[PDB]
Amino acid sequence: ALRLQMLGTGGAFAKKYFNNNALLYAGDFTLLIDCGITAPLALHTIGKSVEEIDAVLITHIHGDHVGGLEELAFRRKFGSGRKPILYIAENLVEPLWENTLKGGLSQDGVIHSLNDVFDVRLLKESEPAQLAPELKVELIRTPHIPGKPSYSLYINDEIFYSADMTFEPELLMRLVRERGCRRIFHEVQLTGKGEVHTTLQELLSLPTEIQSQILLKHYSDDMESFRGATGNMDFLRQHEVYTL
Amino acid sequence: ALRLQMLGTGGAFAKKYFNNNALLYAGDFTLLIDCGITAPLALHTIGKSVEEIDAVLITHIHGDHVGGLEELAFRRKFGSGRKPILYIAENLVEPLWENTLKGGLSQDGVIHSLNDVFDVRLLKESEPAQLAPELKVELIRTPHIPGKPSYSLYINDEIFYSADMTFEPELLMRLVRERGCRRIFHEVQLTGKGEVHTTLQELLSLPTEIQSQILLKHYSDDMESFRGATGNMDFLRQHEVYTL
Ligand SMILES: [Zn+2]
Ligand SMILES: [Zn+2]
Ligand SMILES: [Zn+2]
Ligand SMILES: [Zn+2]
């Protein structure tokens, strides 16, 4: 059975919680979903070696989702030398390398492209990929920063992992209505206007049945002020291991 | 009098110590020297608001020195809106923006260049700059990664801050002999071959008088195994406030 453990559950600036990055365990296969500036410290905190990461999947380009990749890449290069598999949309490959990782990683005789530190495997929007015997993943293009591609994930045909996105209640409802969706992991912006994130006020306007599927992530340091005030939804606990 | 507090004293992969980033205090003026993936968490740990950072100086492009700049930039943009001053060599401006920060920070109507999030002030190699009444800083070009510009700092005409560099004992000796150098903060690679860092074995070959000036930084998680074995040198303590 698939297992999920969040390395962190926090929004980009939270300090009680690490960056919102997920570990999925399918048998011996370990997928890291996003790898922010705190992911190395978070891995250390739960006692997980970078050698145990079989693949990394990148949902969009922001420091709390890609800022730890340089450390992961170098440590694997200097350790066993095994390049982690990197799952990513084609339209994020060039920005991730050319505008994010190249500055620190590149070195004349040594590292020239993403392929020198990762085993790059492109995912196509709405084309499911069997990552491992019990782990199927489908990218869904969703909005976050205008003009920048960002993605959510549909897992094993029944788990929606929102990653970072603005409010899309028809998407949620359609996944539950047409695609068998049973569990939803949704980011939430607890205070302020939802310009590039989904607010708690927005999620509370969802129908009761959709709220019952939702565990909340990517949240700020005031999360404890809201415990018990999220209707039928609840907050993911950082480092807890969930089955499914 | 000038004061120094390391946000972290660790090498790039250390987990007992944060990334090797320095705070300098000259009266009310606060300079951050480098801003790695751990710098936001380290600032939080010592209770320092990002609003108190008056300027940031970048010695070279690596995640443990620039990987926290995206979070600093965004938090200042969304907070008081005051752009931090960024001191940097001209030949690092384009790689820092185009190949490191642009991917996550850029946004069509909003952020197009480094100047949209920083007040960029170029430093010239070997041209001292008075940052504040009691803080003069001079970039010295030193080797670290072949083909990449990286810099050390000469402060108030008498403090050498090595930042990241390979072994340059004639430089040290010449600064002590010709330029009045009284204190040296030097990176150290405790184990392994010194390909892009200075090893402890190398520093131990320095003359006794030069060792007496040196406090060690950028060190790995096995630092405590070496305490008392560094001749007349000693290890910097993370978060201690030093006068000078
Ligand atoms: Zn995020
Ligand atoms: Zn984001
Ligand atoms: Zn370094
Ligand atoms: Zn470096």
Author numbering:
A (entry chain A), B (entry chain A): 2 to 245
Question: Could you pull the original sentences from the published paper?
Answer:
The cyclic oligonucleotide-based antiphage signalling system (CBASS) and the pyrimidine cyclase system for antiphage resistance (Pycsar) are antiphage defence systems in diverse bacteria that use cyclic nucleotide signals to induce cell death and prevent viral propagation. Using a biochemical screen of 57 phages in Escherichia coli and Bacillus subtilis, we discover Acb1 from phage T4 and Apyc1 from phage SBSphiJ as founding members of distinct families of immune evasion proteins. We confirmed the critical role for Apyc1 metal-coordinating residues and identified E74 and Y112 from the opposing protomer as further catalytic residues required for cCMP hydrolysis and release of the reaction product 5′-CMP.
To compare mechanisms of anti-CBASS and anti-Pycsar evasion, we determined the crystal structure of Apyc1 from the phage Bsp38 (2.7 Å) as well as structures of Paenibacillus Apyc1 proteins (1.5 Å and 1.8 Å). In a structure of Paenibacillus Apyc1 co-crystallized in the presence of nonhydrolysable cAMP, we observed strong electron density near the Zn2+ ions and more diffuse density in the nucleobase pocket, consistent with specific coordination of the phosphate and ribose backbone of cyclic mononucleotides and weaker nucleobase specificity within the enzyme active site. Structures of Apyc1 reveal a metal-dependent cyclic NMP phosphodiesterase that uses relaxed specificity to target Pycsar cyclic pyrimidine mononucleotide signals. We identified 107 proteins related to Apyc1 present in phage genomes and also found many closely related bacterial proteins encoded in diverse bacterial orders. Structural comparison of Apyc1 and B. subtilis YhfI also reveals that Apyc1 enzymes contain an extended loop that reaches into the nucleotide-binding pocket, potentially enabling stable binding of smaller cyclic pyrimidine substrates.
